[PDB]
A paper describes a structure:
The macromolecular machines that execute protein biosynthesis, the ribosomes, consist of rRNA and ribosomal proteins (RPs). In plants, protein synthesis is realized by eukaryotic 80S ribosomes in the cytosol and 70S-type ribosomes of prokaryotic origin in chloroplasts and mitochondria. To elucidate the structural basis of cytosolic translation in plants, we report the cryo-electron microscopy (cryo-EM) structure of actively translating cytosolic 80S ribosomes in a rotated conformation (rotated-2 state) from the model plant tobacco (Nicotiana tabacum) at a global resolution of 2.2 Å. This resolution allowed us not only to build the correct atomic coordinates for rRNA and RPs in the 80S ribosome but also to describe ribosome solvation and metal ion positions, as well as chemical modifications of rRNA residues.
Moreover, in our structure, the 3′-CCA end of the A/P tRNA is nicely resolved, enabling unambiguous visualization of its interaction with the peptidyl transferase centre. The stacking of residues C74, C75 and A76 and the formation of Watson–Crick base pairs of C74 and C75 with residues of the 25S rRNA (Gm2622 and G2623) are observed. The NC is bound to tRNA via nucleotide A76, which is stabilized by A2822 and A2823 of the 25S rRNA. On the E site, the 3′-CCA end of the P/E tRNA is stabilized by interactions with 25S rRNA elements and with eL42. A76 is tightly packed between Gm2796 and G2797 of the 25S rRNA, while C75 forms π-stacking with Tyr43 of eL42. Another region of the 80S ribosome that is enriched in modified nucleotides is the peptidyl transferase centre, located at the heart of the LSU. The modified nucleotide m5C2873 forms the non-canonical base pairing with the key nucleotide A2822, which in turn supports the proper positioning of the A76 nucleotide. By contrast, in the tobacco cryo-EM map, only the N-terminal domain of eL24 (amino acids 2–63), which is buried within the bottom of the 60S subunit, is structured, while the parts that are responsible for interaction with the components of the SSU (eS6, ES12S and h10) are not visualized. The pronounced presence of plant-specific elements in the tobacco 80S ribosome is seen in the back of the LSU and associated with three expansion segments (ESs) of the 25S rRNA: ES7L, ES39L and ES15L. The plant ES7Lc helix splits into two additional branches (ES7Ld and e), forming a three-way junction stabilized by the N-terminal end of the eukaryote-specific eL6 protein, similar to human and Drosophila.
Residue numbers in the entry:
A (entry chain G): 2 to 125
B (entry chain s): 305 to 404
C (entry chain q): 50 to 242
D (entry chain b): 3 to 161, 182 to 230
E (entry chain R): 2 to 127
The structure:
Amino acid sequence: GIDLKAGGKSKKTKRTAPKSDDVYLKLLVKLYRFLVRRTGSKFNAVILKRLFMSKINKPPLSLSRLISYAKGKEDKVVVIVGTITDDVRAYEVPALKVCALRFTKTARARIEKAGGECLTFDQL
Amino acid sequence: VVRPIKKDVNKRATLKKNPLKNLNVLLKLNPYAKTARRMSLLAEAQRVKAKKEKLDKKRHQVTKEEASAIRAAGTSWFKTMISDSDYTEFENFTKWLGVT
Amino acid sequence: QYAKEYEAQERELIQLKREARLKGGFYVDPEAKLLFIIRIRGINAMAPQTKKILQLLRLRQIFNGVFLKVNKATVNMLHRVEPYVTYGYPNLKSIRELIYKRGYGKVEKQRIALTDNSVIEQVLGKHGIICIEDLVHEIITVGPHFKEANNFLWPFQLKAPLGGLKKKRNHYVEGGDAGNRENYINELIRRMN
Amino acid sequence: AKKSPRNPELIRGVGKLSRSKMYHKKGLWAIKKKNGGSFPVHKKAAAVAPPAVKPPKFYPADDVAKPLVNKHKPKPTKLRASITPGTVLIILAGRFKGKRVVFLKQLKSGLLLVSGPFKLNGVPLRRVNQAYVIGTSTKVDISGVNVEKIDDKYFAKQANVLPQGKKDDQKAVDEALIKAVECVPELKAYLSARFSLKSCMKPHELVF
Amino acid sequence: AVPLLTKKVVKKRVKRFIRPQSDRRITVKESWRRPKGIDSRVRRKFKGCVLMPNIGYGSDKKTRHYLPNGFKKFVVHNASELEVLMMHNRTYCAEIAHNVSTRKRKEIVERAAQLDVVITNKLARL
RNA sequence: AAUUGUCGGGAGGGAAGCGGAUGGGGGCCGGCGAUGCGCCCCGGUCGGAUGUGGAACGGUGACGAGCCGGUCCGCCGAUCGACUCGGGGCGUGGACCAGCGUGGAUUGGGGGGGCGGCCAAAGCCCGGGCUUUCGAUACGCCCGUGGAACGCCGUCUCCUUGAUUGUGGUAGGCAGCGCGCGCCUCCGGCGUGCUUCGGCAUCUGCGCGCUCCGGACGCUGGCCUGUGGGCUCCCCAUUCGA
RNA sequence: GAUGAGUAGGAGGGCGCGGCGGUCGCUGCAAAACCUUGGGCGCGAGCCUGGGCGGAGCGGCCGUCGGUGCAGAUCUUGGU
Ligand SMILES: [K+]
Ligand SMILES: [K+]
Ligand SMILES: [K+]
Ligand SMILES: [K+]
Ligand SMILES: [K+]
Ligand SMILES: [K+]
Ligand SMILES: [Mg+2]
Ligand SMILES: [Mg+2]
Ligand SMILES: [Mg+2]
Ligand SMILES: [Mg+2]
């Protein structure tokens, strides 16, 4: 015998692929698997890991909070693995380059009217 | 931005050979083993030849006076090594122990 | 250079002993700085402290072997598990044969056979150890980087003794196998490697 | 061209001389001096362009696996020291089991060429595997026996009737062998008699 | 057809794993069932008792599911399904389904002979 | 299905049944186990340019131009190629099972040699002195750089053997080393440096090769419709277990 | 590369039965069911197939659903 816990095997479980059956999400996962393998970029690894997560683990971000966090960084492309919702409490919308898994219709309309763009992760 | 593609990562594991049996593996791990073996074999052959010829030299590492000093020191050390106690501390067992 | 150094140390020890005898005094040999520890009991019915110490020594299987630098902390740790192990002072031949025949390195927590000097280099090049002989010298001399080199060595998986054991339930002093058997560990290593 | 080896082998794979002595003996210094302090550079041999193989008539649906290279090459079979030309051998297997025969030479394939002689015990010129033979201490002169023209090809099948040429060759070979045998007294009877184990005879104790 | 397989087929066990006591009670069938009884000696693996299957008996992946002839089985119900093996005749053999009529079996056999596809039961219903 | 009769095989000293290993007998199996391949000669069929026209069409481009391209049909030259077409030659070749050879891995034995440590062994022997005994003719002590042969321990090496086994399949890699690129009188010798005076990875480069070198290859035989080979099937016997 | 015990208990991947929406098939040149010291595949649940009998239907695959898997319950009914 060998004095090991569970024969030296791991007892922690983590997501290794999306549980969803969305074909577009699967294609994005393939894209970022390739990117992670052939680039070794920490950002790409984080994106790939978040692509696996469940709905509650990909909470939405409000438009007002996005504007607040993008203050002074409007030249950078803001990336969120999740949904971006509109906020009726936000009055002035600047021109923002935003990439997300999905945009609500109102949020997309406001972002496009303000002069920004809404991007998908392949475009990113 | 992709790093160069890799094709020679999936190499089969090299079979482990004991360096103590086969020479090439030992030399690969330690090249000086070749020289060590050569010198050992040559020294053994020279010693065997000297023994067989019976023409061996008369080598004295230590001179006569220091050899005598060494012998005296060794004799004294042996004398103290084999020495015994007087057993005089056991007065009640003096007769039994053969002291008197 | 290492081979010359070993020969010089042996000659110096012999000369020191002879000179001490000539002067009429005594020469106290330097205390062993290195030990080899072999587990001789199984993993059944283990007391908590003994089990924890045996894990800390990396002895999880019967007849596993590991080197251990001599220290008050390490010696006191070994004193608690004495009944479960036997240990002594390994020879140069013992160390060399162990590393050559059963030496496995730990790279990224994996067990890789030391079939090339590159395996040793990849882990211990920062410390100047780039070859098998360098590793042997570091282990035997307990050099400044002994800890890293020793941890790099996977615990040795030794076979059952060729001639068997005497009695593993008793100390070596009583005629058993447990405990410090000092220079006689080398013959046991011969039979176990 | 050097007529003698520069570095005799103490053992297999180890030379008697070191790299410095080998440098001195090989004359690299002389070559450098003659060439002007620099070794002469030799161009790499040009590879032969592959022949224009005609296009295949068929295309397999599967990629056949090419075996990996094996760097080990077989060496010639060793001949036991106890077996030397003229040694008497005991056959332990086959239709001639127990027969005592004279050893002539070892062939290229490693098999042993032996003769009865044919007249004495009916054993012709034949090949016997060394693993099925015992070499004894009895030796007979075979210097006058000529078997140069006989080789492994002499016994090759051409695929019932023994040609007369083989009989004549066997007679010619056996004439000198019998002449040599007659010198040793009682050797004729010894070769005409088979070996057998009687009661309380232990193979591991017989010296042969 | 020359089979592509080269490694020899090795079976770790050729005996069936018969249910315990199926020899004793007629109502207990042979098909394997793992005992769950608290005292079951078979479950406890007492020596000299009925052996239980486990993953350790698994066949080598290279020779797994290979028939003794060196090919793998594929069931074909008509000649149209036979052409699927046209490019796999060195690894796959065709077995005609048990319910196919003799008339269709002849056509399947002829087509396979044309395609050099091995049929395991080409003599059935002849 | 339980259960029962008949016929046939088999077993049975106070249960039977069952797990593992062989064997006897039976039953079954021909994808159970091949006969092809390459190079030539003869004969028979079918087609043969990068040339010139026609039919439809494609890749790319921008379902434009331009460039490039295949299929089919008809012609002038070219006189070649193919055939699971036939005949004749040379070479080579299959599945399974054994024997043998040379080696790799792992492993258990046998026979030697060198060196070192010890009271710098102890003892024994050779000479120079001292000592003088009861198990009566001993125990003995040291002087020599005196001489052979051991003992134990450690260490470095050579040779020779039996057993199990070959996992992988695009690499001439890695390591070590020979021959040529100089000569002589060729068991070897000749140059520069450092040496403990033995020697040294100090000069050590190229081309061609060799090996204990990134996991087994080679030769031979037997047999192929047989009273052969195989078997996970069946009935039994035996050893162990139960 | 390391590693392998498991009652109560948890979970994953699979096997099997009967319908529904689709799809691909089989069948009087013989379907289902049943029978068989015929053969084979899978560690296994099971699966594929030879032969027989039977004489009119049946199956594979993707989803989806359920009155869906027995050795026991002094279990039920029937039979012996
Ligand atoms: K039953
Ligand atoms: K289990
Ligand atoms: K072998
Ligand atoms: K259907
Ligand atoms: K059946
Ligand atoms: K269904
Ligand atoms: Mg282990
Ligand atoms: Mg106890
Ligand atoms: Mg019945
Ligand atoms: Mg229902």
